[PDB]
């Protein structure tokens, strides 16, 4: 029994080509170029996925530190007060309170300045 190639190759190809729609030039037209690009893409995503967290942690910090700065103290000491005052609550994300509901951030500042000494 002879088993020609037939549908098989074309179909596995069209799949990848779908995944590559949108890529520049030959990179979204040539199967061989498409796969290669995808290889890179997949790896990037998985690694940017890891970074994404590490990214926002940073953004938050600056915004927090910005609000702490105008409020007298700095980020370093602010966290310490909070970490000491047992207020593990504020996850550095939810310290977006600095942006909106500042009176609450303010309340949270004295709690930290209190825990200082």
């Amino acid at each position: 029994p002879r088993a020609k190639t037939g549908v098989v190759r074309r179909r596995k190809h069209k799949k990848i080509l779908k995944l590559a729609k949108g890529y520049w030039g030959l990179r979204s037209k040539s199967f061989r170029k498409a796969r290669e690009t995808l290889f890179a893409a997949g790896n990037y995503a998985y690694a940017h996925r890891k970074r994404r967290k590490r990214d926002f942690r940073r953004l938050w910090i600056v915004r927090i530190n910005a609000a702490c700065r105008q409020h007298g103290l700095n980020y370093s000491t602010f966290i310490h007060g909070l970490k000491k005052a047992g207020i593990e609550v504020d996850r550095k994300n939810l310290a977006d309170l600095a942006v909106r509901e500042p009176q609450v951030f303010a309340e949270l500042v004295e709690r930290a300045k209190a825990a200082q000494g």
């Binding site: 953004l59 700065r69 105008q70 942006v99």
Partner: protein, 137 residues
């Protein structure tokens, strides 16, 4: 999901330069050029205050510096490397020395330039008395 600010208004600031240590001042100037002090900070927007500097011709700088310390420009041509000491910079256009400091302190991207334009430096005192002249130190 984290807060994104909308179209806000730039806070025009005014800093007196004379007396201030060159690099030290530039650092703060840079920070103001980005948000980084406003708790709604957003890394991809351009929201830093419009810093205005005056009396830049009177920036202080430790050590020998002025005598030594030299700025180098490079023309494309052979030998095209020019070298100019801090001394002669102030002799002529001096606002340069502060600019070249704040510029080198901004991020190198297309955004970096947008911000570098918000920095207005003058030999001072005096300048475009547009709106806000919020003294700052």
């Amino acid at each position: 999901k984290t807060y994104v600010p909308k179209q806000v208004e730039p806070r025009w600031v005014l800093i007196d330069a004379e007396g201030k240590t060159l690099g030290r001042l530039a650092t703060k100037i840079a920070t103001l050029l980005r948000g980084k002090h406003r708790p709604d900070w957003t890394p991809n927007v351009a929201m830093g205050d419009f810093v205005v500097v005056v009396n830049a011709d009177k920036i202080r700088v430790t050590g020998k510096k002025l005598e030594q310390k030299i700025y180098t420009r490079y023309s494309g041509y052979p030998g095209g490397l020019k070298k100019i000491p801090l001394e002669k910079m102030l002799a002529t256009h001096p606002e340069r020395v502060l600019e070249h400091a704040v510029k080198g302190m901004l991020p190198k991207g297309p955004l970096g330039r947008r911000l570098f334009k918000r920095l207005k430096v003058y030999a001072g005192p005096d300048h475009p008395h547009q709106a806000q002249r919020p003294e700052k130190l």
